[PDB]
């Protein structure tokens, strides 16, 4: 909290968590995520489901 | 709702402004439904109450 470059990139993060599956399915994605470390990866992504 | 060729009130329309996807939508369909109530049982019951 209290950042001016690490809060809007978290508010687009949150938007994803949350359009991927939620109210409305899936569709047929199956979203291939790719990253490097898990230590600059939010755990919400990193838990399976 | 007005006839713009005369400028005169034709009908009166409900106040609602411009409501899109926003709040309007109501669904509830599968795969998460009220059959998918396997939890976390204490938590669910609290919501019903």
From Swiss-Prot, chain B:
Q: Which N-terminal residues, if any, form the signal peptide?
A: none
Q: Which domain of life is it from?
A: Archaea
Q: Which residues cross the membrane?
A: none
Subcellular location, record wording: Cytoplasm
Assembly and interaction partners: Homohexamer. The hexameric complex has a two-ring architecture resembling a top hat that caps the 20S proteasome core at one or both ends. Upon ATP-binding, the C-terminus of PAN interacts with the alpha-rings of the proteasome core by binding to the intersubunit pockets.
The UniProt comment on domains reads: Consists of three main regions, an N-terminal coiled-coil domain that may assist in substrate recognition, an interdomain involved in PAN hexamerization, and a C-terminal ATPase domain of the AAA type.
Similarity comment: Belongs to the AAA ATPase family.
What role does it play? ATPase which is responsible for recognizing, binding, unfolding and translocation of substrate proteins into the archaeal 20S proteasome core particle. Is essential for opening the gate of the 20S proteasome via an interaction with its C-terminus, thereby allowing substrate entry and access to the site of proteolysis. Thus, the C-termini of the proteasomal ATPase function like a 'key in a lock' to induce gate opening and therefore regulate proteolysis.
Protein name, as recorded: Proteasome-activating nucleotidase
**Span covered, complete protein:** 107 to 155 of 398
């Amino acid at each position: 909290s209290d950042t001016s470059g690490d809060r809007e990139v978290q508010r687009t993060m949150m938007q994803l968590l949350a359009e991927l599956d939620g109210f409305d399915p899936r569709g047929d994605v199956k979203v291939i995520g790719a990253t490097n470390r898990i230590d600059i990866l939010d755990p919400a992504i990193l838990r399976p489901g | 709702a007005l006839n713009q060729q005369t400028l005169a009130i034709v009908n009166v329309l409900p106040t609602s402004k411009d409501p899109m996807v926003y709040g309007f939508e109501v669904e509830e369909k599968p795969e998460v439904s009220y059959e998918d109530i396997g939890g976390l049982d204490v938590q669910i019951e609290e919501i019903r109450e």
